[PDB]
DNA sequence: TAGGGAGTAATCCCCTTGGCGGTTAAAACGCGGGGGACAGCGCGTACGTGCGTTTAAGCGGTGCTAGAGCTTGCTACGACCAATTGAGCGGCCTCGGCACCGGGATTCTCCA
DNA sequence: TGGAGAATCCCGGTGCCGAGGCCGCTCAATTGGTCGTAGCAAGCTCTAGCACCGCTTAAACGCACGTACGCGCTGTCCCCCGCGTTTTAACCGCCAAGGGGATTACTCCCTA
């Protein structure tokens, strides 16, 4: 008997492709699962998880802080053109808000 | 026995920001947008099968599900690395 | 062909039968008027009722579907974790109970003729928004 | 009880500011009262009954989840 | 009413080739409609009695095997038993 | 004698203090009663965890902070710097919502 | 309400970006102008709402602005 | 090749629709902002019912295809 | 004939609700004044209505061929399960990030 | 422009507590084999999508022309802000209750 390879290792993927296999056979997705379907979902799953990441370690760092706090991950989401249209309709617990305010309303010069 | 993603968003983390960290709180919502990402691929992965009278999710159903779910750049650099994961997936077993 | 001539055929004796069946029913309905009429009348009065119930359910129910779109969604996870009717009884009572009137009819009661805001807006006449006049 | 006039005129004062509101009419407080109370009503209605539907006493946060999700008024950070 | 209600007159000003073609475009959609759906049930007929022999031959089936074989020819119908296949026989 | 500022400074001073946090602006103990007196009227003798009230003061802070946002929008639009019922009634109705 | 033929070019025109040589079937071109005409219909009706807010009569691209940003469009 | 064909919705086009929504004036920056919001609109629908018709391998879009790109946006 | 399910009540751990007390910070109350809401007014220009022109959308008709839609044949592949182990969860630990405080420095407002 | 004071910054100090890492186990992911099938490849039909032509008219459009409505401008005021005083009740702590649920006890009778 080989010994087993995880089939993430053999993706190379840091998301777990035989989890994600799983939970597309468990959810009743459809009567049959592919066995490129969880290796593909899982590299998707894993880039979009990059993508916030790198833009809230952004965040984070220019407000001199080390970890992502939910107001980066916030921030991250909004500032971004695509982000924002992917999470349009997403609540963050304590996410807040962009600092806006609309000029109109700012002291007449 | 509770399962959570955190494990390996923090590997994606060390690799995009190795000096960087996360709250468990923002861990929370990196868990909950993996699973509500999960669960809007896998949902219209189902439907694209099913409206194909299919019994199979292959990853062609991904790669429909992720040029209908997804906008723009995110749509285009997530198909390709989709892709090659499957790719290097197959040339290995 | 003629396995599909077959098909044709099939469902024409199931016609056949199926008017059959209703012609027999009239024929007992017939002698039932002739001889019970006012059982029989009775009948379609109690029946016009059950009918009225059941299209003032269905109405109901008609008014309770989609008060809150969430209704349906609340309910599905218990399992996961008239007219023509009313019409012809009225039509038959109108034809030979000649206690019913047609202002018993829901077509009456729906009637321009019998709403007060017609007469406010346009009197005992009947209104068209085609004539300019 | 009518615990709906505990949200008192401040706190509704400080959700106005957070949403970038400059000056606020004193008809607005009741108004937002009104608001609160509607929106409030209807999550814990759709809470309720994946609460009773798992044959459950304690109404529990992902039951409340799922009644936003369900409203399309998805909420992140309580769970998946 | 008619006594009581008094009437005030506003200013107002008002005003067979297309009928027979109107006529025929009604009766040639209304002709073609009425044969998709005369279409529709006579292929309903030949798929719903097939279905019905489909039906009729799991019944037959299951009426001959062993009766372990019931429930699971049966649902080859995708039905428990004759008392849920007959309501979609019927 | 005493310093006093503008009509608007204070409110701009909020503006930037409330926009710049995070935490939570309703008190907690006030909205407890007011879901649990929601709650009686569906079903009594429930509970709610502490994380599904607190999970219930997120979602509508977010809903009336972004409802706000939409009618000072509407106020504006009115030439207004002051928000008035009638923006929350056209937000809402725009929304589908009233 | 759009007369057909324009809309048809239109969403054929429209095609071409995203895949050459396409056919339409004539009920999917329906689909899309009645979707189209019910879109416009009711997003003049939100507009009119911002012109009638507002005191005015005439309805401005300000108000189209407006109905989309709160229909959640922006 | 098909070009400029947005112009195909003409202003009395517009004005009917808007008409249908109460609206009772019309500015003459309505027709070309329209016109926008017309082209964004349906540019997604298309898109989608496009990335249907290609997942069935068909070279025809279908009314079901519009269908189930119409009901995405319902989304 | 026997085994294990149905009934029931005592036993005992977990945990959510409610009250008490303080105290303290935020909500409530007052009031001056300001400035923004809003009504009233003037103009002008910009948009709806009408008429003559044109333009091309829509209907009836002919011809073609692509490709949707269905039937047939087979093998590849994912469902399935028994055997093996290591990835990933639950519990425990500690130190360093971050907050919160205090006081001195720079910014911003507003009135002169 | 200046200025005073009030508001916000920043810098250093303190603490605490939660994040990140370590350890046991397990159980759920992986290896290996069997069997059915399902969906992929070929081949046939013929459906309806596309292209083109010619006529009809009714919808579009250019321009005349007014007046109805948009908007700047003035006046008023009242009503919402900003800030000081009064009061209340929100938040925290600690104990209480009991209430629910899972395990254990023991008879009685169904069912295999």
């Given at each position: 008997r080989?010994?087993?390879?995880?089939?993430?290792?053999?993706?190379?993927?840091?998301?777990?492709?035989?989890?994600?296999?799983?939970?597309?056979?468990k959810?009743?997705?459809?009567?049959?699962?592919?066995?490129?379907?969880?290796?593909?979902?899982?590299?998707?799953?894993?880039?979009?998880?990059?993508?916030?990441?790198?833009?809230?370690?952004?965040?984070?760092?220019?407000?001199?802080?080390?970890?992502?706090?939910?107001?980066?991950?916030?921030?991250?989401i909004?500032?971004?053109?695509?982000?924002?249209?992917?999470?349009?309709?997403?609540?963050?617990?304590?996410?807040?808000?962009?600092?806006?305010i609309?000029?109109?309303?700012?002291?007449?010069? | 026995?509770?399962?959570?993603?955190?494990?390996?968003?923090?590997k994606?983390?060390?690799?995009?920001?190795?000096?960087?960290?996360?709250?468990?709180?923002?861990?929370?919502?990196?868990?909950?947008?993996?699973?509500?990402?999960?669960?809007?691929?896998?949902?219209?992965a189902?439907?694209?099968?099913?409206?194909?009278?299919?019994?199979?999710?292959?990853?062609?159903?991904?790669?429909?599900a992720?040029?209908?779910?997804?906008?723009?750049?995110?749509?285009?650099?997530?198909?390709?690395?989709?892709?090659?994961?499957?790719?290097?997936?197959?040339?290995?077993? | 062909?003629?396995?599909?001539?077959?098909?044709?055929?099939?469902?024409?004796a199931?016609?056949?039968?199926?008017?059959?069946?209703?012609?027999?029913?009239?024929?007992?309905?017939?002698?039932?008027?002739?001889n019970?009429?006012?059982?029989?009348?009775?009948?379609?009065?109690?029946?016009?009722?059950?009918?009225?119930?059941?299209?003032?359910?269905?109405?109901?129910?008609?008014?309770?579907?989609?008060?809150?779109?969430?209704?349906?969604?609340?309910?599905?996870?218990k399992?996961?974790?008239?007219?023509?009717?009313?019409?012809?009884?009225?039509?038959?009572?109108?034809?030979?109970?000649?206690?019913?009137?047609?202002?018993?009819?829901?077509?009456?009661?729906?009637?321009?003729?019998?709403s007060?805001?017609?007469?406010?807006?346009?009197?005992?006449?009947?209104?068209?928004?085609?004539?300019?006049? | 009880?009518?615990?709906?006039?505990?949200?008192?005129?401040?706190?509704?004062?400080?959700?106005?500011?957070?949403?970038?509101?400059?000056?606020?009419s004193?008809?607005?407080?009741?108004?937002?009262?009104?608001?609160?109370?509607?929106?409030?009503?209807?999550?814990?209605?759709?809470?309720?009954?994946?609460?009773?539907?798992?044959?459950?006493?304690?109404?529990?946060?992902?039951?409340?989840?799922?009644?936003?999700?369900?409203?399309?008024?998805?909420?992140y950070?309580?769970?998946? | 009413?008619?006594?009581r209600?008094?009437?005030?007159?506003?200013?107002?000003?008002?005003?067979?080739?297309?009928?027979?073609?109107?006529?025929?475009?009604?009766?040639?959609?209304?002709?073609?409609?009425?044969?998709?759906?005369?279409?529709?049930?006579?292929?309903?007929?030949?798929?719903?009695?097939?279905?019905?022999?489909?039906?009729?031959?799991?019944?037959?089936?299951?009426?001959?095997?062993?009766?372990?074989?019931?429930?699971?020819?049966?649902?080859?119908?995708?039905?428990?038993?004759?008392?849920?296949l007959?309501?979609?026989?019927? | 004698?005493?310093?006093?500022?503008?009509?608007?400074?204070?409110?701009?001073?909020?503006?930037?203090?409330?926009?710049?946090?995070?935490?939570?602006?309703?008190?907690?103990?006030?909205?407890?009663?007011?879901?649990?007196?929601?709650?009686?009227?569906?079903?009594?003798?429930?509970?709610?965890?502490?994380?599904?009230?607190?999970?219930?003061?997120?979602?509508?802070?977010?809903?009336?902070?972004?409802?706000?946002?939409?009618?000072?929008?509407?106020?504006?639009?009115?030439?207004?710097?002051?928000?008035?019922?009638?923006?929350?009634?056209?937000?809402?109705?725009?929304?589908?919502?009233?």
């Amino acid at each position: 008997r080989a010994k087993a390879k995880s089939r993430s290792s053999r993706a190379g993927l840091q998301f777990p492709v035989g989890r994600v296999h799983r939970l597309l056979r468990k959810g009743n997705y459809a009567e049959r699962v592919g066995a490129g379907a969880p290796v593909y979902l899982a590299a998707v799953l894993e880039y979009l998880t990059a993508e916030i990441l790198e833009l809230a370690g952004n965040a984070a760092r220019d407000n001199k802080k080390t970890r992502i706090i939910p107001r980066h991950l916030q921030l991250a989401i909004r500032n971004d053109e695509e982000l924002n249209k992917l999470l349009g309709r997403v609540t963050i617990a304590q996410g807040g808000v962009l600092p806006n305010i609309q000029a109109v309303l700012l002291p007449k010069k | 026995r509770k399962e959570s993603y955190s494990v390996y968003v923090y590997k994606v983390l060390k690799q995009v920001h190795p000096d960087t960290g996360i709250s468990s709180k923002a861990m929370g919502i990196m868990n909950s947008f993996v699973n509500d990402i999960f669960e809007r691929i896998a949902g219209e992965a189902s439907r694209l099968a099913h409206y194909n009278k299919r019994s199979t999710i292959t990853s062609r159903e991904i790669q429909t599900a992720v040029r209908l779910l997804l906008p723009g750049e995110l749509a285009k650099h997530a198909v390709s690395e989709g892709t090659k994961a499957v790719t290097k997936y197959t040339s290995s077993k | 062909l003629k396995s599909n001539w077959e098909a044709r055929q099939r469902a024409k004796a199931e016609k056949e039968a199926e008017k059959a069946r209703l012609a027999e029913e009239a024929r007992l309905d017939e002698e039932r008027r002739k001889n019970d009429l006012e059982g029989w009348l009775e009948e379609k009065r109690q029946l016009r009722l059950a009918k009225l119930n059941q299209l003032k359910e269905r109405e109901r129910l008609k008014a309770d579907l989609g008060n809150r779109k969430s209704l349906a969604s609340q309910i599905r996870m218990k399992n996961i974790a008239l007219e023509a009717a009313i019409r012809s009884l009225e039509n038959d009572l109108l034809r030979y109970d000649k206690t019913f009137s047609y202002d018993m009819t829901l077509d009456a009661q729906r009637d321009w003729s019998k709403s007060l805001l017609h007469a406010f807006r346009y009197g005992p006449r009947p209104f068209d928004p085609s004539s300019q006049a | 009880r009518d615990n709906i006039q505990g949200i008192t005129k401040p706190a509704i004062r400080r959700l106005a500011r957070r949403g970038g509101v400059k000056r606020i009419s004193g008809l607005i407080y009741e108004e937002t009262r009104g608001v609160l109370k509607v929106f409030l009503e209807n999550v814990i209605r759709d809470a309720v009954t994946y609460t009773e539907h798992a044959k459950r006493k304690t109404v529990t946060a992902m039951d409340v989840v799922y009644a936003l999700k369900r409203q399309g008024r998805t909420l992140y950070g309580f769970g998946g | 009413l008619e006594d009581r209600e008094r009437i005030v007159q506003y200013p107002y000003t008002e005003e067979e080739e297309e009928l027979a073609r109107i006529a025929e475009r009604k009766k040639e959609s209304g002709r073609r409609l009425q044969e998709q759906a005369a279409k529709m049930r006579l292929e309903r007929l030949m798929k719903k009695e097939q279905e019905l022999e489909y039906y009729k031959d799991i019944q037959r089936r299951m009426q001959g095997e062993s009766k372990k074989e019931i429930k699971r020819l049966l649902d080859e119908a995708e039905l428990k038993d004759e008392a849920a296949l007959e309501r979609v026989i019927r | 004698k005493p310093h006093r500022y503008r009509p608007g400074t204070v409110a701009l001073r909020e503006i930037r203090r409330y926009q710049k946090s995070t935490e939570l602006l309703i008190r907690k103990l006030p909205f407890q009663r007011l879901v649990r007196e929601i709650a009686q009227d569906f079903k009594t003798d429930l509970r709610f965890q502490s994380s599904a009230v607190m999970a219930l003061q997120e979602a509508c802070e977010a809903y009336l902070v972004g409802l706000f946002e939409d009618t000072n929008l509407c106020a504006i639009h009115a030439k207004r710097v002051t928000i008035m019922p009638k923006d929350i009634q056209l937000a809402r109705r725009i929304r589908g919502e009233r």
